[PDB]
Write a protein that binds this DNA or RNA. Structure first.
Length: 49
DNA sequence: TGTTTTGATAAG
DNA sequence: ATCTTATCAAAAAC
């Protein structure tokens, strides 16, 4: 199996960024991961909260 | 001639 | 004119 594109530290970190209005397009670049991958790990439905 | 996640992309 | 979601070929590592 392929390796996850993001460890735990990055997740909650990205998680917090997304709850500040940071565009997923921005955080894909900074962390080097696909935008679509950001929607899977952090659905927009689980952030509005 | 053989599992797990990524990420482009169409669809809503 | 975006934002999101669901999908799925294929990469990546075994």
């Amino acid at each position: 199996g392929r390796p996850r594109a993001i460890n735990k530290h990055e997740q909650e970190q990205i998680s917090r960024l997304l709850e500040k209005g940071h565009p997923r397009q921005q955080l894909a670049i900074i962390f080097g991961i696909g935008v679509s991958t950001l929607y899977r790990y952090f659905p927009a439905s689980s952030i509005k909260k």
